[PDB]
Design a protein around this ligand. Structure first.
Ligand SMILES: *[C@@H]1O[C@H](CO)[C@@H](O[C@@H]2O[C@H](CO)[C@@H](O[C@@H]3O[C@H](CO)[C@@H](O)[C@H](O)[C@@H]3O)[C@H](O)[C@H]2NC(C)=O)[C@H](O)[C@H]1NC(C)=O
Ligand SMILES: *[C@@H]1O[C@H](CO)[C@@H](O[C@@H]2O[C@H](CO)[C@@H](O)[C@H](O)[C@H]2NC(C)=O)[C@H](O)[C@H]1NC(C)=O
Length: 308
């Protein structure tokens, strides 16, 4: 919509009063100057076609710990702790998907360090939606099953790191300088001397509800979920987020990596795709148990097929 800032000092003071200090909002952080049009661009979920996940008796009746972190449970899987940067696209549906697929190749696929190409998925799955104008996480995982995806060695993400800060500590260029269209779908690597290797799942499925989410995470590792983004979330700095003010900005896809309790408040730990400058080093904590902003309404996951 507008070139009107999403944040104001008055808006953030209201938020910090209404949230009762359970989470901290910050006006003069990395998102201070973000525009209503740029904020809505980050939120690329539009629009089940996947079968519902079925647990065995042993999976369903296992006593889950009160704390869990995917990076500590699989300390030899180096993709889990890495933070993506979707850049100036509505590519979150594809970026969260490709991140969790990279992680599952190590947790289940016998491959320690492969990065699945978000670019390949964004550009070639026309059935998933319309690239940087948004798309459907469930269709992304169905595409990983039927067609498959190259690694980011074959097809690196086309859009560079960008900052919303004036002086980025990482020295990234501003995101205000960029506004990207869906890349072309290619059938060779960007360097055609790198041979094409196709990576597939043998099964893809849907999840619903706190219990399903914790069991899937514990047994199989990170997966893709989505929630409603309101203006207050843009200002998130630390603590367990819950919505208290601001208008609806769209659906956003993210990567669930953990859960815990912080001073009696249950949370999910989540890897965002807005680089390591935003939130808690690229992470946020959100309230678990009550489907906060619909986060527990729909997850998408799958089992990578081991190569050869
Ligand atoms: C499929 O292959 C094409 C290569 O033909 C990729 O599109 C190209 O993407 C690169 C970035 O990776 C673009 O480079 C940029 O050029 C602009 C000028 O328009 C400039 O602002 C930047 O400095 C940057 O270097 C290039 O424009 C673009 N070319 C074409 C013909 O589309 C595409 O990204 C590949 N798709 C995937 C999914 O990998
Ligand atoms: C948001 O933009 C404002 C200005 O529009 C930035 O504040 C200025 O930053 C310059 C460097 O670019 C400083 O030298 C000035 O002291 C600041 N001027 C004013 C008028 O405040 C601000 O840094 C931007 N915020 C973020 C976090 O990027």
């Amino acid at each position: 919509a507008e070139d009107a800032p999403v944040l104001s000092k008055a808006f953030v003071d209201r938020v910090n009063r209404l949230n009762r200090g359970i989470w901290k909002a910050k006006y003069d952080g990395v998102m201070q100057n973000i525009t209503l049009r740029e904020a809505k661009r980050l939120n690329g979920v539009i629009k089940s076609i996947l079968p519902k996940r079925r647990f065995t008796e042993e999976e369903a009746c296992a006593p889950l710990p009160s704390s869990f972190d995917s990076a500590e449970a699989w300390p030899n899987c180096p993709t889990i702790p890495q933070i993506a940067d979707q850049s100036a696209c509505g590519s979150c549906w594809a970026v969260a998907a490709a991140s969790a697929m990279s992680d599952r190749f190590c947790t289940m696929g016998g491959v320690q360090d492969v990065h699945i190409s978000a670019g390949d998925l964004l550009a070639c799955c026309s059935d998933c939606g319309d690239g940087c104008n948004g798309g459907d996480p469930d269709r992304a995982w169905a595409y990983f099953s039927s067609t498959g995806l190259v690694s980011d060695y074959c097809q690196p993400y086309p859009f560079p790191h960008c900052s919303h800060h004036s002086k980025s500590k990482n020295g990234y260029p501003p995101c205000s300088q960029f506004n990207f269209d869906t890349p072309k779908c290619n059938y060779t690597c960007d360097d055609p001397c790198i041979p094409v290797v196709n990576y597939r799942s043998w099964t893809s499925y849907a999840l619903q509800g706190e219990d399903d989410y914790m069991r899937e995470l514990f047994f199989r590792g990170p997966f893709e979920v989505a929630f409603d983004v309101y203006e207050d979330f843009i200002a998130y700095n630390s603590g367990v987020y819950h919505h208290v003010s601001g208008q609806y900005l769209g659906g956003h896809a993210v990567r669930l990596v953990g859960w815990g309790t912080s001073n009696g408040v249950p949370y999910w730990k989540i890897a965002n795709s807005w680089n390591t400058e935003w939130g808690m080093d690229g992470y946020f904590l959100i309230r678990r148990g009550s489907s906060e902003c619909g986060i527990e309404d729909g997850g998408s996951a799958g089992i990578p097929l081991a190569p050869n």
